[PDB]
Symmetry: D2
Subunit: 114 residues, 4 copies
């Protein structure tokens, strides 16, 4: 599990369950190719999102459907989506955890790189 | 003003109006002495909270009544109070803005000690 | 109508010289560039766009945070910081995009004035 | 474990190791009584901080020595300490994780309440 997510709901103080996300890798011509999708469980995580094989060095984009999450909770949110874009160097069993803290009009994207 | 606040409500996307706060200074014996109280206006600010003379170097504590704010919003807050404790160094016309981002189960306390970058 | 306030959470000052670009979502799901700019020393950009240039629709503001950290001598996590949102500037509605930066974290908040 | 912490360093992108903290419970007269102290491990956590028996409902204050953490890192911190003060409601096996995100001039205190 070289790419992990942890999404928290800052209003409820619980992980954000059922958040749809997708992972894209930057291609040679500068475009994006989608390599995985998933939805967070009740713990705000997604296990086995991608494998080491799918996660070579490069630039990646994780897009979180935060709007749907808030719309479903009954809140009108600001952001259409939450985008996390970063260069990955996973060569060496390097784990990446994308922590995301959500409020209707704010989010925090932090990274923990082990 | 040597000490300003800017409180934002991350749920509504507006400044947090009518947030009560108190400013205390640490005394020589380790206790706290309250030197100002106030309540944010609709912009999430408090003008003329304290003067330069009331703000010598020392340890200060700014306590925001975020629990009452959330209770009044019909929400369920986690924190009893939001507390910002810092050693103030006002020498050299250094002014402080305490930025505070509020959500019921989270707050962010940031400080801005210069109006410009360097 | 659109304002930004970028703060540096390491230094406790605004983030100056941060490059950004403002794009507007097009019918077919694409983007059109409406403005570019660079924050001044107070971490703001004045007269970024005008009222007529900011009609209802989805906008994307890209902040070149990677360059900012690089110039500051830090190695950052994010390749860029993107803020994407539905804008409804009808009336007096002004938008402030507040951005709090650390090398391995940022917080994007919005302050939206009523009418 | 009814009370856990998770501290991250937003400058380095790692958990914040070796952060000193103290846990106190508010008394009937509005004073404080110390119930635990500890230091985060390399994952930014402290295992077995207190027991369920030591954690009845009431107001608690967790003080984190962030100033020392930043001083040790060679940085210049703003805050003299980071305090998280909250009325704890552990009934029905509810546990608390105090998440803390640290930058020299900013921190975020969030709480995660779970039925574990
Ligand atoms: N048992 C885990 C420990 C762990 C608990 C939490 I909760 C966590 O989550 C956050 C999420 C956000 I979003 C934050 O802003 C912060 I600070 C901490 C992370 I990452 C790690 C482990 O295996 O290490
Ligand atoms: N543009 C204004 C200046 C200004 C606007 C805002 I809004 C602001 O406040 C915050 C509050 C929080 I909480 C944040 O996380 C951030 I980033 C910025 C500050 I300080 C200054 C003017 O000069 O008129």
């Amino acid at each position: 599990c070289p790419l992990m997510v942890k999404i928290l709901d800052a209003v409820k103080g619980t992980p954000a369950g059922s958040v749809a996300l997708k992972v894209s890798q930057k291609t040679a011509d500068g475009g994006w190719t989608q390599i995985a999708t998933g939805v967070t469980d009740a713990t705000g995580e997604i296990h086995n999102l991608i494998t080491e094989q799918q996660f070579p060095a490069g630039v990646y984009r994780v897009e979180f459907d935060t709007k749907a999450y808030w719309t479903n909770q009954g809140s009108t949110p600001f952001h259409e989506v939450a985008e996390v874009v970063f260069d990955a160097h996973p060569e060496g069993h390097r784990h990446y955890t994308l922590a995301l803290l959500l409020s209707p009009f704010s989010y925090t994207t932090t990274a923990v790189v082990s």
